[PDB]
Specification:
Chain A: It comes from Mycobacterium tuberculosis. Chain A: This is Putative malate oxidoreductase [NAD]. Chain A: One of its GO terms (molecular function) is NAD binding. Chain A: Its cofactor is Mn(2+); Mg(2+). Two copies of one chain form a homodimer. The first copy, chain A, is mainly α and about 500 residues long. Chain A folds into three domains: about 70 residues, Hemocyanin, N-terminal domain (Up-down Bundle), CATH 1.20.1370; about 170 residues, 3-Layer(aba) Sandwich (Rossmann fold); about 150 residues, NAD(P)-binding Rossmann-like Domain (Rossmann fold), CATH 3.40.50. In chain A, about 35% of the residues lie in helices and about 5% in strands. Chain A has 20 helices and seven strands. The first copy, chain A, has a four-stranded parallel sheet. Chain A has a three-stranded parallel sheet with strand order 6-5-7. In chain A, α5 runs antiparallel to α7 and α7 crosses α16. The radius of gyration of chain A is 24 Å and the shape is globular. Chains A and B meet through α2 and α3 of A and α2, α3, β1 and α7 of B.
């Protein structure tokens, strides 16, 4: 009655290739297959790894759109992991950003019906009060970083919910390719807390938390229960997740930023790359931040939050906390000043979608030329594209992915450059948990070389991971120079 | 460390709240429970928002080995897949576009350069010599109508696998596929450095003969009664196999026999209206090639059933070619001797029901049909040409040329005629009407031989299932019911000349018509 077992059911077993790690496709030679008992199950060819990846690449260009390619790499994440990851060497800048921001919105909305975030713990908060039992299926050693998005505000679109894993996996997938963190040493997770657009809820095949876009005072301690049951396991792992920047980010960071090693890239990593662009401009301009005053158009959470970033960055070469308000100028949040008659040495741009009919005022006045818009959605801001923005025709780069002007070539600024080197040094030093901590963006200037007057003015070229290694050399110094850590290594640390 | 990853024993979300906790998953799957029909409705709704010209096949192959039971649930609910999703686009896409890609969890490849490891290769999976059925191996030569694809040939067999168990209730647990990599000759594949197969050329010698001879004998040795059949495979090799090894082993050929079956089925479908005994059915063959004679051999093999000698039946057949009807004293008779202008042939032959598997685009002319139309009141046209737009004629004009008094059947899917007096029917005549049920019935009988009579009762069981729109052959939508109707006739014919391991009263086709796509 209770037990039903048979003497006849057989799966026609697959052997030692169902696990993704070291599947390596046909990269097995005759000695390896006949050792692992694959005699006759792989196609009887032999392909070197780099030739095998190219076979996927020539395969990958045969697709036209950018979404069907994500479905193909989704097929190769579960089988032959190294290909999916060592393909990125063949073309990383195009593919890996495309994996992250443009394609996921179409993948998560239209196709995130996959129930295979394998490393993902799609934990609910309604029935599951016991959540640590999930890790029993997954020790404290050999674990470096972990992502746990609540899936509340994706870039293209916020609040889809259960599909937030593809994002958390996307950060991890981009984490390792940029930072070299072993994929075995990272886990992905996303809590279906709700945060559901009624469109997503109305879908019958949603496969997520049912009608539970739930908030209030109960929210934080539910997340706090998870954040304390992670550090109970290991404070030696970076819980690097992505949520909306509005309220939880600072509240969680204020709650756990001192005692634990947690951060978010959007509010912390982005301003670092902005500081790298400021120093990259000051190198050719020769005007330090002391005599350089800034504007913060929009006064957004990340924008006005950068006031503490620029101020504490000026603490190295600049005056006290009161001096920042005199050297910084906020505007455009309530329609301030119904705009700059002085101090224009470094201009930020719109934290708001409003695109601004050019204002050649900064072009005319005496200054070191440095203005950037820094907003992706409208593909415009207080300044137009750099060509029209070059009304004076000096250099300026955009946070929006832009093309060169033409000679007059800049590169796009992205926070993708920061959080690999940020977490890599933490995976190296084993940090338990400031601006002086986060001050690794100066290494981008070490690899920028904007010394050429006209050609290169961007942070760094996208096809190089060696800039992340140079950030590690700047990040590892956080142990001796910046505070608490567990770093004892030599300067080389070639294979961490 | 993800436990319980076997496709057959995984149901995705379908596992209830208890099984998710009892089997040690503890929330890795989302907080939903979906009835397997709801999961199929989700996949169906998901599949449609795509390119759907070969976009789907990418999604299905990952869904194949990620979740085995669902795939047949969604594939059960189909009229599009039976040919478009997995009998054309694999050739169009998967065979060539994804040749540097592998799907070989179940099924295996071997090489003509290594005859030694097969028996060590076959036992890679835990295979009981008892529990197996319908293992398929193809050399990828002449797949459909394109040519050699090398080691891609699995996508055909694995595709046929999807049609076997969804059509004939075979258990994929007891089913395997194979690929005989003997070396391709397509210049592209060899030039392509990223082709995951043998770079050698075709081999046609005693090495090949000893190879297949040392592969078939161990296929039955390691496990007997396994229905060995080769799909879209070299005919000069194919016919050679059946004459050589078919006397003491269970083998059939979809290219040569299942086609010859369904063609037979359509002949009786007209005979129900023609009111004529099949013995005196004089026909003309168009192919005279390697394959067109095979269906002619099966038709002749059934022509004797109603009382025709060997000499009279071949006299009741005229083969035709564009040089002319195959004749005696023609120096190049091409090693076939049932022979002894076309418009002149139909004139005096007066064939009541003529077919052509010869691929010649649109050679049926209004003057040709009229000669048969005037001579015989109800003639049966059969442009069996599989290519969609390379058939011998369009049906709508042929019915209009004979004033609907003629019968048609098409290899490729077609729309109804709609000759404005009355609307007729399709006449789809693929192989899917035959081999799944011939697989299920022979799994029930456990026949050591798949005899001619056994094949004939299958086609003439098809006739009852669809008989007097004016359809000669049934609709593919109602496939799981006709597969039972053909297994009853297979068992009925298995017991003639005592060939069945098993015996039963026949209330247990449904118990061996298993892998009903739902769970529990």
């Amino acid at each position: 009655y209770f037990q039903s077992m048979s003497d006849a059911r057989v799966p026609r077993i697959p052997a030692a290739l169902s696990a993704p790690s070291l599947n390596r496709g046909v990269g097995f030679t005759h000695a390896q297959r006949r050792r692992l008992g694959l005699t006759g199950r792989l196609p009887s060819a032999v392909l070197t790894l780099d030739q095998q990846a190219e076979r996927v690449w020539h395969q990958l260009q045969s697709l036209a759109t950018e979404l069907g390619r994500n479905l193909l790499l989704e097929q190769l994440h579960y089988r032959h992991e190294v290909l999916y990851f060592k393909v990125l060497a063949d073309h990383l800048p195009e593919l890996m950003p495309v994996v992250y921001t443009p394609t996921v919105g179409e993948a998560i909305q239209r196709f995130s019906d996959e129930y295979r975030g394998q490393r993902g713990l799609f934990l609910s908060i309604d029935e599951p009060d016991e959540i640590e039992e999930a890790f029993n299926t997954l020790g404290p050693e050999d674990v470096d970083l972990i992502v746990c998005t609540d899936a509340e505000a994706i870039l293209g679109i916020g609040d889809w919910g259960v599909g937030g894993i593809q994002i958390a996996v996307g950060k991890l997938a981009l984490y390792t390719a940029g930072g070299g963190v072993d994929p075995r040493r990272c886990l992905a997770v996303s809590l279906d807390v709700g945060t559901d657009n009624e469109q997503l809820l109305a879908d019958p095949f949603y496969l997520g938390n049912r009608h539970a876009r739930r908030r209030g005072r109960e929210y934080d301690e539910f997340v706090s229960r998870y954040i304390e049951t992670a550090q109970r396991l290991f404070p030696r792992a970076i819980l690097h997740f992505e949520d909306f920047g509005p309220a939880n980010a600072r509240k969680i960071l204020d709650t756990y930023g001192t005692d634990y090693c947690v951060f978010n890239d959007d509010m912390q990593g982005t301003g670092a790359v902005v500081l790298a662009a400021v120093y990259s401009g000051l190198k050719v301009t020769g005007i330090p931040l002391r005599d350089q005053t800034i504007v913060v158009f929009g006064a957004g959470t990340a924008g006005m939050g950068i006031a503490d970033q620029i101020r504490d960055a000026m603490v190295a070469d600049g005056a006290t906390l009161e001096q920042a308000v005199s050297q910084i100028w906020p505007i455009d949040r309530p329609g301030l000043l119904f705009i700059k008659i002085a101090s224009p040495t470094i201009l930020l741009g719109c934290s708001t979608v409003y695109g601004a009919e050019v204002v050649e005022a900064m072009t005319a006045s005496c200054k070191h030329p440095m203005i950037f818009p820094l907003s992706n959605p409208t593909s415009r801001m207080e300044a137009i594209p750099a060509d029209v923005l070059a009304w004076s025709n000096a250099l300026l780069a955009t946070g929006s992915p832009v093309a060169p002007v033409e000679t007059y070539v800049i590169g796009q600024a992205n926070n993708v450059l920061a959080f690999p080197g940020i977490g890599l040094g933490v995976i190296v030093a084993g940090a338990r948990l400031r601006r002086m901590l986060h001050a690794a963006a100066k290494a981008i200037a070490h690899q920028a070389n904007p010394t050429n007057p006209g050609d290169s003015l961007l942070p760094d070229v996208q096809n190089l991971r060696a800039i992340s290694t140079t950030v590690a050399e700047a990040v590892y110094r956080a142990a001796v120079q910046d505070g608490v850590a567990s770093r004892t290594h030599d300067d080389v640390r070639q294979a961490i």
